[PDB]
RNA sequence: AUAUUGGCGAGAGACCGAUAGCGAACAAGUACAGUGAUGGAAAGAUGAAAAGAACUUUGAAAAGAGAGUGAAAAAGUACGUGAAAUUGUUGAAAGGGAAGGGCAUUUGAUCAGACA
RNA sequence: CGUGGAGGUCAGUGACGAAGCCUAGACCGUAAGGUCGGGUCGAACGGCCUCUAGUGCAGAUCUUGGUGGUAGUAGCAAAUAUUCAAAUGAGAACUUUGAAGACUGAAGUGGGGAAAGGUUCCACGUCAACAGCAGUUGGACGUGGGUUAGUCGAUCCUAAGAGAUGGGGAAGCUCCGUUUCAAAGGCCUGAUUUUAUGCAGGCCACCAUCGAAAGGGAAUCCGGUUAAGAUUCCGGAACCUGG
RNA sequence: AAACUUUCAACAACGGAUCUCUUGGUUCUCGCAUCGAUGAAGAACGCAGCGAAAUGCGAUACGUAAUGUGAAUUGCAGAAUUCCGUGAAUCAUCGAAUCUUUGAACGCACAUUGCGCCCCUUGGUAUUCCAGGGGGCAUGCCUGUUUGAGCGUCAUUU
């Protein structure tokens, strides 16, 4: 790390993207069904194996 | 917008398969101005900023809120 | 076939406190360690796991199948096997019950009702409608969901019209007396069935 | 030792990511997949390993091309465009 | 609103590559509103609008080569039909249709025949 | 009883399609018979409902009521009618979703198409 | 003419009914474990309809008490029914190193039948 | 005797309440069990004659789930140490600020990097969970911002080693070989003044390629600047490579 | 006599059995024959006015073209010119296109967004250096085309 390949960084940023709460609008969706983002992830909980 | 209103500075988010020849050019020709120099960088989404230095006759401030942000 | 199997567990075997079941292995998951393959296993392959090749079909001999068919259609007379059966005949003239062989050349339901009502199945065609109820099982939700008593059995020698005529009325059912069949002159096994022949059915029979 | 503070030692890649596969199975020394066999021209695969071969068959993926066959076969392969009509 | 392709294919080659450019300034303007405007839909329709465009310039493009090699042996191979790989090696009704000269002679001497029982 | 060999009896099958079924199904699905009276007028019995037509609850609480159809919820298999809602405790105000089977269509909203379907049943029109 | 636990499209069952049935009825080959090969879950149900509780009051708030909606809140996004282990409260009893049991009767509580 | 499903039948029961569940209330049976009342409930269900089987549990250190006694119990005791006041806040042993008392003692509890993490950085908001007391605080939660180079690295080179190629083995997945029993390739300009580049010499026979963010290696410094970047921005002053 | 323990009951907890549901599974049966160098299966990264996923799609990015339908989409915002119409639609159909970075994967490499060569064209005063745009260069093999090698070898010059 701290001098990484444009491959890992290209990861590492779709992963910041996806690592947000569930837009509390499509709660409002008729038939949701989604109550919360159950595929959030925390940097000192589940390491991201690379 | 302090880069912008301190720096004589444009910046733009710009496409990653561009680089600092195509950005110059880009600017340059959309924009009507002239550029002296441009730093490039990439974001931590995964887009490219570029801090694109205008010469000093141009006022980026004017060019910034004459193509319409402010 | 592959259920139940779908696992690489193995057992621990003995010296671990707990019971020697093949476990699934690896972690992480909450699945592993569990019980693994045995029918007494959450996730396991049943005992003696349903097969195809199961005997589904039985053999009776020709003869006697005649001998059951022959027995039931001589039930269809004798009123009061009829009667116990289901079966509202107490109001119709006599049995066997003959009817015209005018009957099979009806081309309208309409006129079929008509025809079977004046020669007296009313009663009997009233029971069936009357009695239509939703299945008790689970059998309710695999393709069984009603269930009702059976009418009469009309027997004609040609079908000119009576067959499609009749097709759509609740309980009744056709049949060419060439055929005649076992599940249909006993339903449930149960002889009597009130059966209504055309006279050309009815000399056909010898 | 062999224990807990060996494990301190762990901070080495014995594999990086597939680009076949992107899988974190790119051996580094030995320039292969352990998952899907690249750089061989085939694919890494086993008949003793089933729900391996599952969870990477065909139709697990997005299928660009394959899914539009079936439609073009029932319709004879058509070719130029269709015509007009009315209401 | 949004630019029709029936319409646009009337439009000269020029007046396409113009439209499309008109459309790409215009764009790019609404790019600097959606980060002031807390919605900005009206965009949609402006980029789905370059699409059709684009679609058409492309079209005209593809079907003036698609005649100017209609009939001749050799023609791009994305013009071609597509069809199956193996369909495509397939050989053709002519190769497959094909006939020995002794086999031929007996087809014609002795046809299967068109017959009856009865009488 | 069926006949067919292409169409099925199975309570699943049908149950998914129904559920699963396209907008554009869900069009014909949700009809409405007409009124007595526009049954002889046109020489049809019913209809897919389409918006801006007029409509006749003939069933269930709110039956009697009456009003213009402003959308069909297709989403929903509802129909929402512009005049028959639910006030609230805030006072604020929410459509009612109805079942096109159980109105009764009172005026046509009528287009070409729409004459053109009318036909297509062998109907007339005034 | 024969084969077919693959593929496309169909019709079915004396089959399973959410610990069953395919591992997966759900964002399931997911989440998660492992350096890797591989391993691999749990998890369906408000109501016809959100009508998903305006308004008042106590509270820092979460909430509570009212009100209100509903056929029903003894359906309140902990939601159909809502057993058992196990728990709180209330009421009744008994208890000198376990408790529970059998035959029998006293005492308390409780109850069916039959009288005419 | 009892269960799931199947044929027949009683035109069986039921939203005027099916099923289920609860009940030291009633009744039938020696028993498996059966029937009723009341309560709870909300959409289905049963009697009889037959058919059928994934048909009856206390045990299997049985499977999965749930739950206890143990018990408000073992404990929360290494790394010297804390204290007064104010501010804030519903709330302060624990937050902020001031004071004081100490510690690490440059072989650091300082100032930076490599591997590894991947946003943890920084601001604002902020306490349901988490930080085995707490919490107004946080590496938590929400929402944003932030990583600027001709000269710093990579990129080039070669190391152990890896590894295509003409080939040779191997039924074959592939194994061997690396300049090896191979017709292995490219530079300098001349000849053109139909013209763009054929031929004219002379050479040189090196035979892939990957393999070092610590080895080799063209070149940048000081001052200033940010909430968070800086040998990268700004200022000034240089230097290298190519043209 | 409390408390405590125990038993029963009512109400209230805990927990999720049971009953009733089922767009799933399982098994049978019938009909059918269509992946890929015309770049398949698979990967990665992206794309929406407001999306983390699932589904969809590829810088023309929950879609473009065409055809049928005939008025929706809907969680909110939105368009408003789209409703007697070459016309709504997260519609159906699908014959035409777009199809990033990749993959047998093909200029060379690849723990690198690393490094060449050719052609056309544009800019910088440029056949030669730099930059932008487009188009190309894997391997075995077959037929053919052209250029060739060998005293393998025939004839023909004087
Ligand atoms: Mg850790
Ligand atoms: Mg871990
Ligand atoms: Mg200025
Ligand atoms: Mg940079
Ligand atoms: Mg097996
Ligand atoms: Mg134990
Ligand atoms: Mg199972
Ligand atoms: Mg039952
Ligand atoms: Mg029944
Ligand atoms: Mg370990
Ligand atoms: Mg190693
Ligand atoms: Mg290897
Ligand atoms: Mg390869
Ligand atoms: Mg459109
Ligand atoms: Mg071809
Ligand atoms: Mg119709
Ligand atoms: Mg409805
Ligand atoms: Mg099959
Ligand atoms: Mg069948
Ligand atoms: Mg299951
Ligand atoms: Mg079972
Ligand atoms: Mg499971
Ligand atoms: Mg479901
Ligand atoms: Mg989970
Ligand atoms: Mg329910
Ligand atoms: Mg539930
Ligand atoms: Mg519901
Ligand atoms: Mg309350
Ligand atoms: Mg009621
Ligand atoms: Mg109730
Ligand atoms: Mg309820
Ligand atoms: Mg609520
Ligand atoms: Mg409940
Ligand atoms: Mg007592
Ligand atoms: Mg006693
Ligand atoms: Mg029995
Ligand atoms: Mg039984
Ligand atoms: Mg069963
Ligand atoms: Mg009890
Ligand atoms: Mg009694
Ligand atoms: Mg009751
Ligand atoms: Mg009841
Ligand atoms: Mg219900
Ligand atoms: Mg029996
Ligand atoms: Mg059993
Ligand atoms: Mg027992
Ligand atoms: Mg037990
Ligand atoms: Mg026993
Ligand atoms: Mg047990
Ligand atoms: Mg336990
Ligand atoms: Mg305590
Ligand atoms: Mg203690
Ligand atoms: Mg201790
Ligand atoms: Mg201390
Ligand atoms: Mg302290
Ligand atoms: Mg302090
Ligand atoms: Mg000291
Ligand atoms: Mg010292
Ligand atoms: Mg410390
Ligand atoms: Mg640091
Ligand atoms: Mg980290
Ligand atoms: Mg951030
Ligand atoms: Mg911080
Ligand atoms: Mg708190
Ligand atoms: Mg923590
Ligand atoms: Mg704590
Ligand atoms: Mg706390
Ligand atoms: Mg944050
Ligand atoms: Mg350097
Ligand atoms: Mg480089
Ligand atoms: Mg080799
Ligand atoms: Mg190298
Ligand atoms: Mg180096
Ligand atoms: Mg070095
Ligand atoms: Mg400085
Ligand atoms: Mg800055
Ligand atoms: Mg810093
Ligand atoms: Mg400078
Ligand atoms: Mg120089
Ligand atoms: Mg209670
Ligand atoms: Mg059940
Ligand atoms: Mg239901
Ligand atoms: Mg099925
Ligand atoms: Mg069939
Ligand atoms: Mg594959
Ligand atoms: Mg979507
Ligand atoms: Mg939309
Ligand atoms: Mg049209
Ligand atoms: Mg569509
Ligand atoms: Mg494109
Ligand atoms: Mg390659
Ligand atoms: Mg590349
Ligand atoms: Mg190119
Ligand atoms: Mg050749
Ligand atoms: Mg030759
Ligand atoms: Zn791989």
Redesign the interface.
Known sequence: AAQKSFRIKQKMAKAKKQNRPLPQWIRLRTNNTIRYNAKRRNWRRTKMNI | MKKVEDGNILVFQVSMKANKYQIKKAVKE?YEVDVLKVNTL?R???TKKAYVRLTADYDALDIANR???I | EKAGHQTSAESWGTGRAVARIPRVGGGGTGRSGQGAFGNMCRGGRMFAPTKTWRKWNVKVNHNEKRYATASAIAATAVASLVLARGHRVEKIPEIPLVVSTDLESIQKTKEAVAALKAVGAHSDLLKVLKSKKLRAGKGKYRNRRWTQRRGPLVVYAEDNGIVKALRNVPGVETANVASLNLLQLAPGAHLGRFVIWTEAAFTKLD | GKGTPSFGKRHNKSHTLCNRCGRRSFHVQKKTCSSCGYPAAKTRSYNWGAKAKRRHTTGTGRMRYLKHVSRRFKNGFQTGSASKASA | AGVKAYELRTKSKEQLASQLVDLKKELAELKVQKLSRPSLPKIKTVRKSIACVLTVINEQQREAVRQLYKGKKYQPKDLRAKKTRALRRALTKFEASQVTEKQRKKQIAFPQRKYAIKA | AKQSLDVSSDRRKARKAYFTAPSSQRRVLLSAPLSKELRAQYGIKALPIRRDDEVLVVRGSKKGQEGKISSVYRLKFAVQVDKVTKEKVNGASVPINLHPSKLVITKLHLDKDRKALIQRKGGKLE
């Open positions: 959309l990439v931590p989404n995964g193509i319409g942000y």
